[PDB]
Design a protein around this nucleic acid. Structure first.
Lengths: 124, 97, 106, 181, 150, 168
RNA sequence: CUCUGAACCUGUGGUAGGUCAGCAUCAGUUUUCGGGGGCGGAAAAAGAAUAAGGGAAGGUGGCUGUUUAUAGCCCUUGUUGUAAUACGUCCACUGGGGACUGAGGACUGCGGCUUGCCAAGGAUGCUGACAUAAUGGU
RNA sequence: CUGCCGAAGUUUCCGGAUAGCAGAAACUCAGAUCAGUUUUAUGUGUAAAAUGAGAGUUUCUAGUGGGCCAUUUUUGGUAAGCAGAACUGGCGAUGCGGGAUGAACCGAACGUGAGGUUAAGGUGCCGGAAUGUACGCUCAUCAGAAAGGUGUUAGUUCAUAUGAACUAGCCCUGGGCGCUUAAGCGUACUACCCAUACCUCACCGUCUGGGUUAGCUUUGAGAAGCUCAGACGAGUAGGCAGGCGUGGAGGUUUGUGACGAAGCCUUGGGCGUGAGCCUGGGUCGAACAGCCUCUAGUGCAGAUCUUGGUGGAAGUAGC
RNA sequence: GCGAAACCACAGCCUGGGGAACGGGCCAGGCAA
RNA sequence: AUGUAUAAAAAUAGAGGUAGGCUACUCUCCUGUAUCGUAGAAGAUGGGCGAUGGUUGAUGAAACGGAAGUGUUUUAUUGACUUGUCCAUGAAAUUCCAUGAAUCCAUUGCAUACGACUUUA
């Protein structure tokens, strides 16, 4: 059970490159005569349930860990017993003060922190 | 797999003691010999794994048991000396090695 | 400089393709001296390589090699199908590929 | 066997068959130089090919042979554009290539492809009355080069005879003749 | 573009897919039956090897309406124990010799999903076999065909 | 890969016809199944016997009794053209009766664009007497003065260095 | 008295975390060369071998005509024989080459070898190099 | 945003009520009935064997309620074509390989992938694959892919080695480059090329059939869980289901925030089939969010859409 | 020196065939600087 | 890049060579899988022997080569090398694959949509 994906590239919206009012978020083309919706050659792909990844590998980072979002230092403690499968993602608005409290606690706990070097700076 | 089996006339190799040649004899030296955590800095601990004499003395014995064997076959000693190569229009399948 | 060349020269023809659809995963290679499907059996399994140079000096050298492996013959004229670790660029059509003699089965 | 530079003699060769083998070779990243293109041959008698040109404007067979290949290669594709420059078609045998070997293509040889008694046309003869006006000078160079080449061949033949006599006189030759050498 | 009459006949034979294959008890009704589907099927007399090889390599049971492979003798006897069929040899014998329980034995084997033949068909395929194609009757020539799809 | 198959067949016996007559003929078919189907079509044309009305009793292939001795074969054939009614008779010199038959089929398929269904083999015979031979070409092949150079010599190893000698 | 693999000296004791290539023994799916055999076909047909006869030839010798000669052939038997080859078919006969896959995660089951062991209810070993760049992504 | 099912495209009476197709529910049965089925046989129909599939009802409710093409069938035709009714399929709701290209022709009907092999069609080059083998025919001075011919090719038949009359093929006259005992045609047999097709496996989902508690140190009871097996996957109108996102509302995270909220840009890194999400850096400076429910002025590419901004036109018309 | 409005999916060599226009995009072509 | 190696013409349905005095000869072809070159720590150290030749580098130019001659030889000498026949050491634990004129300018009319053009300067 290794982290293997059925596709890397994202699904862009059709004609989203030409226009700027058209967003790159995938929108299903409902055009009645839309040949790109009709799956012609030289067109783009389209999301299907056939593109799902392994259910024992869904949500898994390329190193095998599933990201887990820890707000405060209480959250980093409950990953005590899943440190081999989950990685303590630090929320984006957590201040540099509690950010060190989260990383030092998680280092001793044995869990892996994904963004442990943000807004902080080491000193020897 | 990385050796081409040549049909050259076979050389007696029964004389040399082949039993001492094992996996342990050819094993790569274990990643060992810890150093105190001051000599790693300043790079003042570097040893050299220079080939031990008995390894040569093993081979010199092997030479002493194969060099006499090979000169008897004419042109064999020079044949090993020469370096294998391909000229133009060389088809390995056609010309058996 | 007579010597060296423990390999056999070969030319990279194109990709495996229909009339209009190309699959670049596997490429056609025409090895010198190979002119029949029965003859190409000898070269099945060999290690083919693409050797090219570039301006950047990486590891102190200037050579980048994309390894590969011959898989099956391709037609009656001695062509073979070779899969590489990285699919060859479409610009290298009609170049030189070096078919070294290992893994040897002889 | 393939070389970086290949010289192909066009005398006694079919145009289309010669065009095919060079078209594949050119796509193979190989430089091919064609000499004596004026002596190419096309199946069908002289009048038919004359009518073909009348319906069809480059008078040089070197250009005509290049033109035939040009439509026989992916000219639109930039790969085909690059491969075009690797082909050099010249009339006669120029000095840069006269002192080099001239190989032939079996698949294009008239004697191996044309039934006896079948009419054929020569491009140089065909081009003589369509705008080409250099047959005499081109021919004049041909005998001049072949006369010099024939003298070279005689010297080479004499050298070959001398070394052949020396080779036979060598006792080493028959010492190990069991190898077929 | 299969004719509606032909499709009804060939769904009756459980040949729902191209390059499928089922065993058929030859009788008087069969000849005039597959006259409609002659340009759409081929058939012939299979020898014991072809009967044996198809059931071994590609013989899947129909257990609780599931395509269950026959890789152990317990499967056949659990379904065909009532007909004294207890192992693969008996299944071959119930098929090859066409025993009393041929109807039940035939239904038990899922239609063999064969492959595209090694070496392909003839240059043209959708003509009668006697006319150079590969459709219709071919008698003892079926065995050469199954050994290309096995 | 034609091969001469003998076919014997008879109609299904019944209370009206307890003993059917035995009908046997030699036809050239690439396999047994083609031979049987052709035999039924021939019987329908001549005796009007359906496949169900009858049944084949024996099929057997015939090898050349003397395949190593050259012979001359004459075949009578009826061929279907734009009019749908034509008859021809040809002679060939070959060492195998099948070899003669496949030779004629190629000639028919070339000169007249003849199909296997259209062609029906009427008569097969062996030509032995010199005076029996009629065609000019085989007559030229009969006199003991047969001597001529090999025609169509023309003899991937591309880019041969030397000019081919193409002589003796 | 135990314990804290507790701190240090003492060990230079023993095992060594990811990425990528290499070979090996296996398994599934295959593609491709082989070898050895069984049965069947006019029990191939032939052929050679093989004692004759007859015949004619595009006729050897004799002389276009001619009949084995100073070439012989063909046909017919005879002919060894159960010849061999080929073709068709089978082997629960066997020996190699190459590619793509490793899904599952104690134990069962079904088999074989002889409790144990195994190619039998899906891949494990030996190694290396890179890592302190390779493999990677944009 | 994704997932499943998915027509009808029209009978019939008469703008409609029917029907039919598709569903949704309720029923009774597989030891019962069936079939755009095939036989047997009695007189093409009818009745009674095989091959398969479980089959039949009742209720209520969306959409359709056109055609085109092709096949055929005929009737007449009518200059001649053709027209007129039908007949049955295909497209229409359907992509892919081939046909130079081309909606109607030849193949094959679609989850994401790896290998294998093929169909139709092809192997001179463009072009993936034999400038394969065997045999003929084609000479065109427009090839090729009604007839005439001091036009040939093979000839046949009849006359006495020659002619005449004929038999037939082909030529002449009336996709590109090239190809010419072909790279043309025709037949045959080998080998090879490749599709969203066929096989084997992986994976996603759907449906169907299971298994599972005195919860047994296999620990796998979010029983709404875990686990096992098999087949399957086009889609308009339309039906069903699960989700993502915005503003605010009660509960909650003893949540985040001047050690930097929200926002914004960025070829930073990730996650999800996707809607979307999490995070690094730069700006930034005072608020904000995850979860369970409540709620609605809630999701944009169009509307010659409203408002504001901004270009080309253009330093143009010109003044 | 002072300075618009109209218009604007996007473009712009043809040759032919491409069946439904197809040329303004497709395939064969040449051109293409 | 990896030997970055190779020159007759011409028939091909007869050519070529070989030899004799165009006339009588003969021989080879039937390809290149040919031929040349290819031996050494990339090819070591020396000892020789043996050629006493060969292989070449370096320069000193001689002729040939018009076409696109730019290369073919001839060498003159020198420098090395020489596995031609041989020896003795030596080469490695990386101890399994990855490697100064001219233009504008002035002149200028020989010009003249405007440049250009036109001499002079």
């Amino acid at each position: 059970v290794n982290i293997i994906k059925k596709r890397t590239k994202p699904f862009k919206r059709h004609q989203s490159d030409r226009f700027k009012r058209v967003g790159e978020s995938w929108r299903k083309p409902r055009g009645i005569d839309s040949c790109v919706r009709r799956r012609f050659r030289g067109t783009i792909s389209m999301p299907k349930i056939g593109y799902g990844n392994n259910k024992k590998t869904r949500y898994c980072m390329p190193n095998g860990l599933k990201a887990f979002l820890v707000r405060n230092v209480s959250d980093v403690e409950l990953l005590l017993m899943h440190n081999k499968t989950y990685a303590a993602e630090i929320a984006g608005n957590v201040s540099a003060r509690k950010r060190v409290e989260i990383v030092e606690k998680a280092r001793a706990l044995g869990v892996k922190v994904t963004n442990a070097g943000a807004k902080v700076r080491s000193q020897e | 797999r990385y050796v081409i089996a040549t049909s050259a006339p076979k050389i007696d190799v029964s004389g040399v003691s082949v039993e001492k040649f094992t996996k342990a004899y050819f094993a790569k030296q274990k990643r060992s010999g810890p150093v105190k955590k001051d000599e790693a800095f300043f790079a003042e601990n570097a040893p050299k794994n220079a080939l031990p004499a008995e390894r040569i003395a093993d081979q010199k014995a092997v030479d002493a048991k194969l060099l006499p064997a090979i000169k008897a076959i004419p042109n064999m000693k020079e044949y090993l000396a020469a370096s294998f190569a391909l000229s133009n229009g060389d088809r390995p399948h056609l010309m058996k090695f | 400089a007579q010597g060296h060349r423990l390999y056999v020269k070969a030319k990279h023809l194109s990709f495996q393709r229909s009339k209009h659809v190309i699959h670049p995963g596997t490429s056609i290679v025409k090895i010198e001296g190979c002119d029949s499907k029965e003859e190409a059996q000898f070269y099945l399994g060999k290690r083919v390589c693409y050797v090219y140079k570039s301006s950047k000096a990486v590891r102190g050298s200037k050579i980048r090699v994309i390894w590969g492996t011959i898989a099956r013959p391709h037609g009656n004229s001695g062509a073979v199908r070779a899969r590489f670790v990285h699919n060859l660029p479409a610009k290298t059509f009609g170049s030189s590929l070096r078919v070294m003699l290992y893994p040897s089965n002889i | 066997e393939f070389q970086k530079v290949v010289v192909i003699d066009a005398k006694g060769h079919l145009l289309g068959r010669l065009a095919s083998v060079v078209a594949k070779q050119l796509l193979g990243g190989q430089k091919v130089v064609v000499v004596r293109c004026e002596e190419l041959n096309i199946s069908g008698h002289f009048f038919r090919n004359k009518l073909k040109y009348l319906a069809y404007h480059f008078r040089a067979p070197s250009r005509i042979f290049q033109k035939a290949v040009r439509g026989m290669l992916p000219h639109k594709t930039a790969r085909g554009q690059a491969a075009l420059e690797h082909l050099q078609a010249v009339e006669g045998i120029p000095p840069p290539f006269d002192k080099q070997k001239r190989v032939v293509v079996p698949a294009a040889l008239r004697v191996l492809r044309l039934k006896p008694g079948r009419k054929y046309c020569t491009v140089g003869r065909l081009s003589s009355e369509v705008g080409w006006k250099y047959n005499d000078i081109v021919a004049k160079l041909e005998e001049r080069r072949k006369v010099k080449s024939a003298a070279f061949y005689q010297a080479k033949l004499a050298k070959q005879k001398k070394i052949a006599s020396a080779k036979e006189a060598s006792p080493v030759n028959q010492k190990l003749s069991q190898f077929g050498y | 573009n299969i004719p509606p009459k032909a499709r009804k006949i060939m769904q009756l034979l459980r040949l729902l897919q191209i390059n499928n294959g089922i065993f058929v008890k030859f009788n008087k009704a069969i000849k005039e039956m597959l006259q409609v589907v002659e340009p759409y099927v081929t058939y012939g007399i299979p020898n014991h090897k072809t009967v044996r090889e198809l059931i071994y390599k590609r013989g899947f049971g129909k257990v609780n309406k599931q395509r269950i492979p026959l890789s152990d003798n317990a499967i056949i006897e659990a379904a065909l124990g009532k007909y004294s069929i207890l192992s693969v040899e008996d299944l071959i014998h119930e098929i090859y010799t066409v025993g009393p329980n041929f109807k039940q034995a035939a239904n038990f084997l899922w239609p063999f999903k064969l492959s595209s033949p090694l070496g392909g068909w003839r240059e043209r395929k959708f003509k009668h076999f006697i006319e150079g194609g590969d459709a219709g009757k071919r008698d003892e020539h079926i065995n050469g065909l199954v050994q290309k799809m096995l | 890969a034609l091969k001469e198959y003998q076919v014997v067949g008879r109609k299904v016996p019944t209370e009206h016809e307890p003993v059917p007559k035995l009908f046997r003929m030699r036809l050239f078919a690439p396999n047994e199944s083609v031979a049987k189907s052709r035999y039924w079509y021939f019987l329908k044309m001549i005796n009007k016997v359906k496949k169900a009305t009858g049944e084949i009793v024996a099929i057997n292939e015939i090898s050349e009794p003397k395949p190593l001795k050259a012979k001359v074969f004459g075949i009578w054939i009826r061929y279907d053209s734009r009019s749908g009614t034509h008859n021809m008779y040809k002679e060939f010199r070959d060492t195998t009766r099948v070899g003669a038959v496949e030779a004629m089929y190629a000639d028919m398929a070339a000169r007249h664009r003849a199909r296997f269904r259209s062609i029906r083999i009427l008569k097969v015979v062996e030509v032995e007497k010199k005076e029996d031979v009629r065609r000019n070409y085989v007559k030229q092949l009969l006199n003991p003065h047969l001597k001529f150079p090999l025609p169509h010599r023309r003899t991937k190893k591309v880019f041969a260095p030397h000019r081919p000698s193409t002589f003796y």
